[PDB]
Write a protein that binds this DNA or RNA. Structure first.
Ligand SMILES: [Ca+2]
Ligand SMILES: [Zn+2]
Lengths: 262, 217, 217
DNA sequence: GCTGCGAGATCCGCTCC
DNA sequence: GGAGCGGATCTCGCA
């Protein structure tokens, strides 16, 4: 946790990994990995709970597409109409069973409305609307629709309706399609939630800013007290701080820190 | 382990179907338009899409007893049993969940304006605000059970290694011949312990004079 | 034990260097011509001539920080820190000592013509007249601290006895786990003192919450 | 119609006092 | 259990 932060930072400086890879490798919190990645000047100059929504039709019926950037999870459900009210119904019914944090979409008649933004404001999940001019996004969106629509005709004859094939497509994609060590995309999502839940136990007691002094040990010589430095994250007797001089993250034991009243 | 149940409720001349879990307590709600079996079939397959059950128990229904329905449920491979449940625990859980959801939905009336939005919002509130045990949501305990069963099923991989190794000793200031092959007993940092056949004695040998070989046929 | 602090004071355009001690409480004041590095080193050497300090604290000052000063201090080989002491205890002690010495010096200025003789007489009178408790003068505490620092004392710490036991922590009547074996420190009546490995903090555990390890048979 | 060799160190396993 | 002791084993460099 606290101890391996500089190791992750220097590894990312060497190789320029991503936040998810750093989290899976060094075990650092996802927030810390995101902070490290975002602060990279080269990176400034793809993640969990990040989804994309696209519109498609088949046999003159309305269907919505929800593609997860990381877990490769696809979800769909029948939609009566493209109006704003029905669109909101589907969007928040999507949150009924999922807990995302980011979402991207294009411009549409039901995307923008006087009540659409205020409704998502209550949910609190950040959403960005823009034009996907990235060639990677263009080629990634194309394959998902073909993959989901190819499985439709493989099970039409003995299913009664199209909404019946709606669940069959999800069964074909999210249940049987497996990579790695026989891991399904839903397995990836469920496992991701496991390590995602851990950081709540730490951030629950960390929601109150504190200033503290730090002391640098050099060959067993305490030297002096230095600070003040903002406490980044807490640990079992270890505290990580930012050095103003060397611009590096340092780890100090709990026996060389005091409390400064606000 | 992975038991599910179905129950319908009537409110304001409308029918709401509820999926209930016994061991964990998952609750799901949906608005059933008509009593035709097509709606029940599509709801069941949507549930199979969004959930991975192993056992389902339910009462009798006008559309449940149909050859096509049994054929479809056997196509999905799930099991189902007929007859009214006689377990008081299941009845108590179902009644408590139904009364709680009814109370929550009737309390939440002024906040919404639409209907489908209202049902899905009630689903959100019931599935999120329900804190059981150490503040665990029903979906949270469900994913806990899934990850626990997955890790207990996959834990056998780390146990089936039984790798083989060679070893050699220093005699009269010079290295000896590569004795083996043999199966390692315990391997830690710096050295590993092995069983010798010449003297039937345990010997600890460092990593600087060993070789690692997969077990033979 | 044997904690010292060095400070400067001004009186009638005269610089006086003062050493304040915590355990013995003795004040040592001398006259310094100027707050230069070489003279500061000379004064520290004069102070070290009859005393053997172990812990020293200093405030901010240009003479305190210097490459030659730090080399000389490492020549001393004594645990000392230099910086800005914001601890209220040290500041309060030093200001109280300064106030006391300022109050006391003006009483014996007239009959003693020499300033050095006057300050020596004042400090002599203070350390021979002022007594606390049952009549404990500061040099008695100082010699007690000095005689507690015998080299032969450290070797007399293990005659025959050494034991081991477990310990469990209690939080509002709810006990914890045994935390593994740990080394004992001393055996009291009704409770014992142990050292934690995770936090390096000394704790006290009741006898009823401690499981004794039997001696080898 | 024929050819490698041993001196000088070092321990094991032994038995005997 | 201490004790020395006979012998198998090792490398290297003559040309
Ligand atoms: Ca020759
Ligand atoms: Zn980077």
């Amino acid at each position: 946790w606290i101890e391996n932060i500089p190791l992750a930072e220097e590894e990312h400086n060497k190789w320029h990994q991503d936040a998810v890879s750093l989290h899976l490798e060094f075990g650092i919190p996802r927030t810390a990995a995101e902070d490290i990645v975002q602060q990279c000047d080269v990176c400034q100059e793809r993640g969990i709970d990040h989804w994309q929504v696209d519109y498609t039709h088949y046999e003159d019926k309305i269907i919505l597409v929800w593609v997860e950037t990381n877990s490769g999870l696809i979800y769909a459900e029948r939609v009566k109409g493209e109006t704003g009210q029905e669109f909101r119904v589907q969007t928040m019914k999507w949150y009924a069973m999922f807990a995302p944090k980011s979402l991207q979409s294009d411009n549409g008649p039901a995307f923008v409305a006087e009540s659409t933004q205020l409704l998502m404001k209550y949910l609190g999940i950040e959403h960005t609307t823009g034009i996907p001019w990235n060639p990677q996004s263009q080629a990634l969106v194309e394959r998902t629709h073909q993959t989901l629509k190819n499985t439709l005709e493989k099970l039409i004859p003995m299913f009664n309706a199209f909404e019946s094939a709606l669940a069959g497509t999800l069964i074909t994609l999210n249940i049987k399609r497996k990579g790695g060590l026989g891991t399904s995309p839903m397995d990836i999502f469920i496992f991701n939630k496991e390590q995602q839940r851990i950081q709540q136990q730490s951030k629950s007691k960390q929601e109150k800013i504190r200033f503290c002094y730090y002391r640098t040990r050099k060959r067993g010589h305490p030297g002096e007290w230095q600070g003040p430095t903002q406490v980044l994250w807490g640990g079992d007797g270890a505290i990580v701080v930012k050095d103003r001089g060397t611009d590096r993250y340092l780890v100090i034991a709990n026996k060389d820190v005091k409390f400064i009243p606000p």
